[PDB]
Design a protein around this ligand. Structure first.
Ligand code: CHL
Ligand code: CLA
Ligand code: CLA
Ligand code: CLA
Ligand code: CLA
Ligand code: CLA
Ligand code: CLA
Ligand code: CLA
Ligand code: LUT
Ligand code: BCR
Ligand code: PQN
Lengths: 81, 73, 214, 39, 740, 203
């Protein structure tokens, strides 16, 4: 707790989740065009959050945050930092 | 079949060993090994990496005939 | 309808309850053809009656041997002991006698199956009515049923047919058990029963050493 | 059972049974009477 | 919406159609009039789209047939494990894998055939096996016949489960057509669930079972004294004795201290010097990385939660100025034509089997595989052949799609339409490439044979004369040798000893060594390029002209499989796409025969052999570089010299190979009667024979016919392939078992 | 309509259309949840009750030997010393008796009411079921006649306790793998020192 690896993992998961919540990523209820333009998608998934943030978005964005954090941690250990 | 028979029986007779035909011709591996394989050794060495001799024309024609036969297929 | 082997499952449709021992059991539908079904009925009867005779001839001598009154060998050794004790009776002569005698009686049974009542013509020593046969697998008459337990009443005959087929199936299963127990213990069946009676929580298939080869 | 026995009477099943019997008979003759060259 | 949809009890389970041969076909169900009906029943049995046009019924048949094939494969695999458990010298071989020859087949003593139970070592007599099961079982950690028995029993249970499922999903709960067309869901599940979780579970087995048991085996512990795998499961201290990072448990995994696990997840490269196989720790790390990559790959496609790709959208987006409408319409083809899917999957599966052959010889993944020369040669040759046959099948089912499932309305100015619209350019350019390759590959050999026969070796294409050095491949070898220095710094060694470096020797025999490439290698590689290009030309020409040509404009109406369109237009025999498959099979045979001959000779001459103090004594003493640049060199020094073992095998345990050598020569020659003749002759001969039977009142009611023209071709090519391949099989196996 | 219906079916497995045949039908899945729930309640009570009673001295067996995974179910993890019968003979008896119970229950599922027709030593009177496979009832299975008016509330309570028991049995298995101690031993280590005994310290 408070360690470096914990900091990278929690921060990466938090920023990816927050970017997904505030419409800065493709999500279950908004999908990207070929020209990378987000348009709403009727997924039919129920969600209590007013921004349309589903549990699917939580799972994928937490996975991507873990992936980015782990790659960053291993690369910084390899680089010497 | 006729000429194979003539040649192998006479090869045994000319080399003074009639037992080779008498014992090996009763089965087909005998024909393959003791007639075709055994007697092709000088022929296919008519030319090799070490040089050539006067049998090289027959080695070349041997392969030539195999090639023409295959092209017919 | 009648009681079935698997309660809640409809009996096999080619089984209608007329045959003795009909609990509707035919999951492979081996008796779909009626003539093949009659053949299999005679097969089951011959197997069951042979099993009952054999199981009696194993159990009663083994019970008497266990008491110590006699020293009859166990069923899996009796042929060897007989041959060692009968050097003037060769195995092949005994086999030839058995084959010709069983051939005579079994060919008569076979020809009655092909042509029911055709052995009733008096060709065998003048026997006519006693070889006519009552039903498929149930010869009857004064020779095979000399006490007349099939000619008394219908319900008595059905009761005895039920008794016969159920005891025959039980004896067939018991002979299978005899084979399996001898292979697993190397002892006779009454020896197995006595060992289980002396110490039942220790003498089980789990402790014979071959049913659980761990 | 009638349909099943009709399938068992189809030509390759009968061929399989008959040739299994014939091959088994030849094999067991040569097992019991090894190396027969002459009568 | 992706969901499970089935129909309940669509087909009754009954033997009624078993009693009616040809029930599946409207033409064949009426029964025979002639003997042609007997052949047509077998030829049409698995042609589901010929039986019906309903795609749902076809798909259900395909699914349940696949279950049947899986059950057959599991019966076969359980048989191999059972024969290892019951009829093998596996435990003796485990105690001494260098001197004992693997054997898992024992013949019964009758008619003198017990001579085939050879003295293979370990106090055992049996047929020597070359499938590599012993090396695979040893790598898995199997130390006893009991574990082989357990796998055999479990395989038969799973085989019964596969046969139950095929009956169940055809007769009880048959999936509807929309279930099968969920290609996005199937790709997600097969990438993440089949391949990804399969690789993860196998990494689990390797780490927890294969690594410690093989570590103890290569340390020299007797296999009967090694603890059983579950002892390594239950006792963490026992595993930490061999891999000290196991004392930390799963905490390094969860705290991203992954470098702690470096004792059992390695990047050594090269081969284990004790066994000659790849490091099992490298394999564990490989399978873990593969598992993660496939688990990520299985999340690409959209199913039910909005995110993910639509494959149709991806395909319709990829079009350009040269290519018209691009990949439009391909999604509809690949979700409605089973044959298009079969063509693609056969092409890639066969190419994979060939790649597997090369990668397993070069980087032998099993302990003591590389010095079991019979096993090495056998598995290379086998997987090469399976690959070639699958590629020819890809050509066949591509052509079948083109005849039966192609619809011009759904392919307007897309890639398929534009490929058809310049098929003449494609075929003419490929024709020129094949002629150029044949001239400048085979004519180099003919030049060399002629120069050598004329006594002019200085005028030859050779390493000591006019040189043709494969400098690009030599540079690739040098790059891969130098890779651990700069471009793969955390790899300790190169991927294979074939690139360069030192000999890997096991038990005084070469496991792997550098494979140098000179003029003979250049020449034979261009032979390979030529033969592959010609096989491609035949199959691709069959696909492109399956529907029409300038000769026959309505060929699609004649079908995929038809003998000809008559003697007119000069003569139109073998215009059908099926006949292109028929010819492509021969050229596949020619190509792959040269490939496996190249393998056998080059390994015997330049890799395999015994190690002494002076160096390496190769099996055929380096004669590849001296004589493989002439046809006469191949005929003498490979075929004539190496056939000595199979033709001298009589009276030994290898005599079965000599007999099969002769019988395969026979079957090959027998095929030429079908290939060279025509059915009109045979039908007239049958007329005379039928007269003789009519005279004696023994004419059959099923009227005898000669085989059809197409069946005559099929019989001819089947016997040609069987005879030639089995000839090479017996030659290879007798040779390498006797001199390996 | 269904008891304990939270609308939680993210894999749409209880969808009725297309899932007619097989075990993915809604009826089989609700029935299977109920069966899993009741078996899990028996297991969740039974996998920790001997350990609790041995720790408290009610039973004389030591708490180490009555831990659920060391009492004979997994002999690599331990065997209880000398039951009245060996575990494999007990398993033979268990196979026979439980097959009787389970096959009769199954025959009620496939053929409702059929287990009240054939003679079963008079027991077929109380084995007719109710037409609802998960809830047979009658004079034995509901012998106290409970749920006269709150049968749906009792079904919800049964399913809630069963789901909790299912999670508890999964926790028993996971904690047995991680710690190699009994579930009550784990609870007492968490109670005695909560910071120094948890999943972060056991890893
Ligand atoms: C970037 C910040 C942020 C993130 C990652 C989330 C994430 C989430 N919110 Mg949300 N929220 C966030 C900001 C906010 N939320 C809310 C108001 C709500 C409500 C009322 C609910 C959520 C719920 C949820 C969950 C919906 C997915 C799900 O069903 O899981 C499970 C998910 C964990 C739902 C939930 O699951 O609550 C437990 C829900 O009911 N959020 C407000 C006030 C307007 C926010 C302000 O920024
Ligand atoms: C903090 C930022 C950071 C840094 C300094 C690194 C640094 C590195 N990463 Mg890495 N990574 C990061 C974040 C980082 N990564 C992120 C956000 C991801 C996405 C999840 C990755 C995904 C990733 C993977 C999947 C791999 C690396 C690997 C590497 C190494 C590549 C060496 C090379 O040049 O190959 C050049 C290769 C070719 C030219 C071919 C290098 C040490 C590799 C490594 O671990 O090898 C030791 C490796 O396999 N990275
Ligand atoms: C299926 C029926 C069947 C078969 C095949 C056998 C088989 C056998 N029995 Mg057994 N038996 C049976 C039924 C059978 N028994 C029944 C129902 C009882 C009661 C017995 C009671 C019994 C005893 C007490 C003994 C045998 C013995 C024997 C063996 C010698 C038979 C003999 O010597 O013939 C005797 C032949 C005659 C008496 C002459 C035939 C009569 C005609 C009219 C002349 C032989 C292995 C003996 C043994 O185990 O080893 C030698 C032995 O001691 N049996
Ligand atoms: C259908 C062909 C056929 C025929 C006519 C026979 C005939 C015979 N077998 Mg044979 N058998 C066959 C097929 C056949 N077998 C097959 C396919 C197998 C399995 C591979 C066997 C396995 C077998 C065994 C194991 C034994 C016989 C024995 C016998 C003999 C007594 C029964 C008899 C000579 C027995 C024997 O040799 O004489 C007592 C014996 O022990 N058979
Ligand atoms: C593709 C799978 C495959 C193949 C090619 C073989 C091949 C062979 N097996 Mg192996 N087998 C397999 C799978 C296979 N088996 C499986 C899954 C099992 C477990 C059930 C076995 C168990 C097994 C045993 C126990 C034996 C063989 C034997 C044999 C050999 C003689 C078989 C014979 O003559 O049948 C006879 C043909 C008949 C028609 C008679 C069948 C009669 C049985 C009882 C039914 C032959 C080399 C025998 C052996 O190798 O002898 C030394 C032998 O004893 N097999
Ligand atoms: C994670 C899920 C999963 C897994 C592991 C598989 C695996 C497989 N599928 Mg795929 N499938 C899936 C999901 C999955 N499928 C979904 C969601 C769909 C619909 C979109 C399909 C539609 C599909 C079709 C249409 C076909 C396959 C086939 C196959 C087999 C490919 C050949 C092979 O490599 O055999 C390797 C074999 C083994 C490793 C032996 C063990 C295989 C185990 C026992 C099966 C595990 C998968 C199964 C789905 C688990 C469910 C259990 C079941 C009782 C409900 C293989 C068994 C082909 C075929 O072979 O099926 C008969 C085939 O034609 N699948
Ligand atoms: C050894 C037997 C043999 C030979 C020589 C050939 C020859 C050829 N095949 Mg044929 N093929 C064969 C067996 C053979 N085939 C069999 C058995 C079948 C039945 C399945 C086929 C079926 C078949 C198909 C289906 C196809 C071919 C094609 C080809 C050509 C490949 C292109 C090429 O290499 O041109 C170069 C020519 C050669 C390599 C032959 C040797 C030429 C020598 C070295 C040159 C000598 C010139 C000479 C000295 C100058 C003249 C002097 C003289 C007049 C005095 C070539 C003409 C393919 C083709 O047509 O595509 C273009 C094609 O599609 N073949
Ligand atoms: C390629 C492999 C494969 C594929 C793609 C399928 C596909 C399907 N199966 Mg079949 N099945 C298979 C192999 C396969 N099965 C095998 C090997 C068996 C015998 C063991 C069966 C026996 C079987 C039965 C008895 C049933 C299915 C059912 C189903 C359907 C739903 C499965 C599900 O919900 O998974 C989710 C998996 C689970 C909920 C359980 C997984 C647990 C195991 C141990 C893993 C689906 C059409 C069901 C169906 O037809 O009704 C709609 C159904 O009742 N399958
Ligand atoms: C709903 C949802 C929906 C969607 O759609 C999909 C999804 C997501 C999939 C889903 C989810 C889910 C869930 C999670 C499942 C899981 C579960 C559980 C865990 C089970 C169990 C279950 C469990 C149970 C059976 C149990 C039971 C137990 C037993 C009795 C035990 C017994 C014991 C005893 C006492 C004691 C001794 O010494 C031993 C023993 C013998 C051992
Ligand atoms: C605000 C709010 C809230 C909260 C929320 C939260 C707090 C969230 C969180 C969440 C999170 C925090 C999540 C996360 C997740 C994660 C995940 C999902 C992950 C996963 C991972 C993975 C999957 C991994 C994988 C791997 C491995 C295993 C190894 C190899 C590599 C990799 C990495 C790939 C609530 C609702 C209460 C209320 C309202 C408002
Ligand atoms: C030899 C030959 C034949 C004659 C071959 C025939 C008719 C095949 C004969 C196969 C078997 C032997 C016929 C009999 C099959 C019966 C099932 C046999 C039953 C007898 C038992 C002993 C099994 C052709 O018909 C033909 C057609 C087209 C191109 C080339 C050829 C060709 O080369």
């Amino acid at each position: 707790i408070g360690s470096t690896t914990n900091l990278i993992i929690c921060s990466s998961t938090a920023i990816f989740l927050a970017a997904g919540r505030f419409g800065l990523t493709p999500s279950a209820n908004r999908l990207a065009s070929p020209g990378l333009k987000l348009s709403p998608n009727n997924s039919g998934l129920q969600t209590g959050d007013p921004a349309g943030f589903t549990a699917t978005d939580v799972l994928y964005l937490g996975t991507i945050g873990h992936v980015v954090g782990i790659g960053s941690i291993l690369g910084l250990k390899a680089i010497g930092a | 079949w006729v000429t194979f028979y003539f040649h192998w029986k006479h090869l045994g007779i000319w080399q003074g060993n009639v037992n080779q035909f008498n014992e090996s011709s009763t089965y087909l591996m005998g024909w393959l090994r003791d007639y075709l394989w055994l007697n092709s050794s000088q022929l296919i060495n008519g030319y090799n990496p070490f040089g050539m001799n006067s049998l090289s024309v027959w080695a070349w024609m041997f392969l030539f005939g195999h090639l023409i036969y295959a092209t017919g297929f | 309808d009648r009681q079935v082997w698997f309660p809640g499952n409809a009996p096999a449709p080619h089984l209608d309850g007329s045959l003795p021992g009909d609990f509707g059991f035919d999951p492979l539908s081996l008796g779909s053809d009626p003539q093949l079904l009659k053949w299999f009925q005679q097969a089951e009867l011959v197997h069951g009656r042979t099993a009952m005779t054999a199981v009696a001839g194993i159990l009663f001598p083994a019970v008497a041997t266990k008491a110590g009154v006699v020293n009859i060998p166990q069923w899996y050794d009796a042929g060897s002991v007989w041959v060692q004790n009968n050097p003037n009776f060769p195995f092949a002569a005994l086999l030839f006698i058995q084959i010709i005698l069983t051939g005579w009686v079994e060919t008569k049974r076979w020809l009655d199956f092909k042509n029911p009542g055709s052995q009733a013509d008096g060709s065998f020593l003048g026997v006519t009515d006693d070889f006519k046969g009552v039903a498929n697998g149930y010869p009857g008459g004064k020779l095979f049923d000399p006490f007349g337990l099939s000619r008394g009443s219908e319900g008595q005959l059905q009761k005895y047919q039920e008794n016969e087929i159920k005891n025959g199936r039980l004896a067939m299963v018991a002979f299978l058990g005899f084979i399996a127990q001898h292979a697993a213990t190397g002892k006779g069946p009454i020896d197995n029963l006595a060992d289980h009676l002396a110490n039942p929580t220790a003498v089980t298939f789990a402790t014979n050493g071959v049913s659980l080869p761990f | 059972m009638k349909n099943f026995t009709t399938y068992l009477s189809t030509a390759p099943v009968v061929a399989l049974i008959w040739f299994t019997f014939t091959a088994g008979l030849l094999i067991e003759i040569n097992r019991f009477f090894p190396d027969p060259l002459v009568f | 919406k992706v969901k499970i949809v089935v129909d309940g009890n669509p087909v009754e389970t009954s033997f009624e159609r078993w009693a009616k041969p040809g029930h599946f076909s409207r033409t064949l169900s009426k029964g025979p009039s002639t003997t042609t009906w007997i052949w047509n029943l077998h030829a049409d049995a698995h042609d589901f789209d010929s039986h019906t046009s309903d795609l749902e019924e076809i798909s259900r048949k395909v699914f349940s047939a696949h279950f049947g094939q899986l059950g057959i494969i599991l019966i076969w695999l359980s048989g191999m494990y059972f024969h290892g458990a019951r009829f093998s010298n596996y435990e003796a071989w485990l105690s001494d894998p260098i001197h004992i020859k693997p054997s898992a087949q024992v013949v019964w003593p009758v008619v003198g055939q017990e001579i085939l139970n050879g003295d293979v070592g370990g106090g055992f007599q049996g047929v020597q096996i070359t499938s590599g099961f012993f090396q695979l079982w040893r790598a898995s950690g199997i130390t006893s016949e009991l574990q082989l028995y357990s796998t055999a029993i479990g395989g038969l249970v799973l085989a019964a489960a596969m046969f139950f499922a095929g009956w169940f999903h055809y007769h009880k709960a048959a999936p509807k057509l929309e279930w099968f067309q969920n290609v996005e869901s199937m790709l997600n599940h097969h990438l993440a669930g089949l391949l990804g979780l399969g690789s993860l579970a196998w990494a689990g087995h390797q780490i927890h079972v294969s690594l410690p048991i093989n570590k103890l085996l290569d340390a020299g512990v007797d296999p009967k004294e090694i603890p059983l795998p579950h002892e390594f499961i239950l006792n963490r201290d026992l595993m930490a004795q061999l891999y000290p990072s196991f004392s930390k448990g799963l905490a390094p995994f969860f705290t991203i201290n992954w470098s702690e696990y470096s004792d059992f997840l390695t990047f050594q490269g090269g081969l284990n010097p004790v066994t000659g196989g790849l490091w099992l720790s490298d394999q564990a790390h490989h399978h873990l990385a593969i598992a993660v990559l496939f688990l990520v790959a299985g999340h690409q496609y959209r199913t039910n939660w909005g995110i993910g790709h639509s494959i149709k959208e991806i395909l319709e987006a990829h079009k350009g100025p040269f290519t018209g409408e691009g990949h439009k319409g391909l999604y509809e083809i690949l979700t409605t034509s089973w044959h298009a899917q079969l063509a693609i999957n056969l092409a890639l599966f066969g190419s994979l089997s060939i790649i597997v052959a090369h990668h397993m010889y070069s980087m032998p993944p099993y302990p003591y595989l590389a010095t079991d020369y019979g096993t090495q040669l056998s598995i290379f040759t086998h997987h090469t052949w399976i690959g070639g046959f699958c590629i020819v099948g890809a050509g066949a089912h591509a052509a079948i799609f083109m005849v039966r499932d192609y619809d011009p309305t759904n392919n307007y100015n897309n890639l398929l339409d534009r490929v058809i619209r310049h098929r003449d350019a494609i075929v003419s350019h490929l024709n020129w490439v094949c002629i150029f390759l044949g001239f400048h590959s085979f004519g180099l050999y003919i030049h060399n044979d002629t120069m050598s026969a004329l006594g002019r070796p200085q005028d030859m294409f050779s390493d000591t004369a006019i040189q043709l050095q494969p400098v690009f491949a030599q540079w690739i070898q040098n790059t891969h040798l130098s890779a651990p220095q700069f471009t793969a710094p955390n790899a300790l060694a190169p991927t294979s000893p074939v690139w360069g470096g030192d000999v890997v020797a096991v038990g005084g025999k070469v496991a792997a060594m550098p494979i140098t490439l000179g003029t003979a290698d250049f020449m034979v590689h261009h032979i390979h390029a030529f033969t592959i290009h010609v096989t491609v030309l035949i199959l691709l020409k069959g696909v492109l002209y399956a529907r029409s040509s300038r000769l026959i404009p309505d060929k699609a109406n004649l079908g995929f499989r038809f003998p000809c369109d008559g003697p007119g237009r000069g003569g139109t025999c073998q215009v059908s796409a099926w006949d292109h498959v028929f010819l492509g099979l021969f050229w596949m045979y020619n190509s792959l025969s040269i490939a496996i001959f190249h393998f056998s000779w080059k390994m015997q001459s330049d890799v395999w052999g015994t190690v002494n103090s002076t160096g390496v004594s190769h099996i055929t003493g380096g004669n590849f570089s001296q004589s493989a640049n002439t046809i006469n060199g191949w005929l003498r020094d490979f075929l004539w010299a190496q056939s000595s073992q199979v033709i001298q095998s009589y009276g030994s345990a290898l005599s079965a190979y000599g007999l099969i050598f002769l019988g395969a020569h026979f079957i090959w020659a027998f095929s030429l009667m079908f290939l060279f003749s025509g059915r009109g002759y045979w039908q007239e001969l049958i007329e005379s024979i039928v007269w003789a039977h009519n005279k004696l009142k023994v004419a059959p009611s099923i009227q005898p016919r000669a085989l059809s023209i197409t069946q005559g071709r099929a019989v001819g090519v089947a016997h040609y392939l069987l005879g030639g391949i089995a000839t090479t099989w017996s030659f290879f196996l007798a040779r390498i078992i006797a001199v390996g | 309509a269904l008891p304990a219906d939270y609308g939680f079916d993210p894999l749409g497995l209880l969808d009725p259309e297309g899932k007619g045949a097989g075990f993915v039908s809604p009826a089989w899945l609700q029935y299977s949840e109920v069966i899993h729930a009741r078996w899990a309640m028996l297991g969740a009570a039974g996998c920790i009750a001997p350990e609790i009673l041995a720790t408290a001295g009610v039973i004389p067996q030591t708490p180490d030997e009555v831990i659920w995974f060391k009492s004979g179910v997994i002999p690599p993890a331990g065997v209880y010393d000398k039951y009245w019968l060996d575990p494999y003979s007990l398993f033979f008896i268990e196979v026979i008796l439980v097959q009787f119970a389970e096959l009769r229950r199954w025959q009620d599922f496939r053929n409702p009411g059929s287990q009240g027709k054939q003679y079963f030593l008079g027991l077929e009177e109380v084995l007719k079921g109710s037409g609802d496979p998960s809830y047979p009832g009658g004079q034995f299975f509901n012998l106290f006649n409970l749920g006269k008016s709150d049968l749906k509330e009792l079904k919800t309570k049964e399913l809630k306790n069963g789901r909790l028991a299912m999670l508890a049995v999964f926790g028993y298995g996971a904690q047995a793998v991680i710690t190699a101690e009994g579930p009550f031993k784990n609870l007492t280590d968490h109670l005695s020192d909560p910071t120094g005994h948890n999943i972060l310290t056991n890893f």
